[PDB]
Amino acid sequence: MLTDPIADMLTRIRNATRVYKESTDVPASRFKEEILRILAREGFIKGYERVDVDGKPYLRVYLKYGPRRQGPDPRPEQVIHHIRRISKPGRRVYVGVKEIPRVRRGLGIAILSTSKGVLTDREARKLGVGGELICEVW
Partner 1 sequence: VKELLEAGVHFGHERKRWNPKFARYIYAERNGIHIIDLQKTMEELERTFRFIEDLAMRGGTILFVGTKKQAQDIVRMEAERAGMPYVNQRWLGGMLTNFKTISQRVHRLEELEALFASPEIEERPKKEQVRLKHELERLQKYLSGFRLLKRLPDAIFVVDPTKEAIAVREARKLFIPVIALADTDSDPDLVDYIIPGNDDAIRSIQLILSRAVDLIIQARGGVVEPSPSYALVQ
Partner 2 sequence: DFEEKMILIRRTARMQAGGRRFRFGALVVVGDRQGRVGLGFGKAPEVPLAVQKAGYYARRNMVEVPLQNGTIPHEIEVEFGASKIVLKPAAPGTGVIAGAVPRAILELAGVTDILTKELGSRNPINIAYATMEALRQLRTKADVERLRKG
Partner RNA sequence: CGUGUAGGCGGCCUGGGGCGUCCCAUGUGAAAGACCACGGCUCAACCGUGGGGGAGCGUGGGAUACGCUCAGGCUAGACG
Partner RNA sequence: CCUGGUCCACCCGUGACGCUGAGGCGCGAAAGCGUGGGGAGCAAACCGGAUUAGAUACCCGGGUAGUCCACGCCCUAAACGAUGCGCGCUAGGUCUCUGGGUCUCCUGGGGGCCGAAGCUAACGCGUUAAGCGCGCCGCCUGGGGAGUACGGCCGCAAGGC
Per DSSP, which regions of 7-129 are E strands? 23-27, 45-50, 58-63, 83-85, 94-95, 112-114, 117-119
Per partner kind, with CB cut-offs from 5 to 8 A, the member of RNA, partner 2, partner 1, none near residue 74 is: partner 1
Compute the residue count for the chain: 138
Per partner kind, with CB cut-offs from 5 to 8 A, the member of partner 2, partner 1, RNA, none near residue 94 is: RNA
Q: Contact between 71 and partner 1 (CB under 8 A)?
A: yes
**Among 66, 63, 30, residue whose Cα is nearest residue 48:** 63
Site string for partner 2, 44-63 (x = CB under 8 A): x-x-----------------
- The nearer residue to partner 2, 6 or 44, going by C-beta atoms, is 44
| Window 21-40: residues binding RNA (CB under 7 A) | 21, 24, 27-32, 34
Residues 6+ apart with CB under 8 A from 75: 20, 69
Q: Contact between 19 and partner 1 (CB under 8 A)?
A: no
Q: Contact between 22 and partner 2 (CB under 8 A)?
A: no
Residues 6+ apart with CB under 8 A from 116: 127, 129
Q: Name the minimum Å distance from CB 133 to RNA.
A: 9
Phi, psi of 2 (to 5 degrees): 65, 105
With CB under 7 A as the contact rule, the residue among 71, 72, 74, 91 that binds RNA is: 91
Q: With 0-12 CB in 10 A as exposed, 13-18 as middle and 19+ as buried, what is 5?
A: middle
Kindly list the residues in this chain that would bind partner 2 in the complex (CB under 8 A): 42-44, 46, 64, 66, 77, 79, 104-107
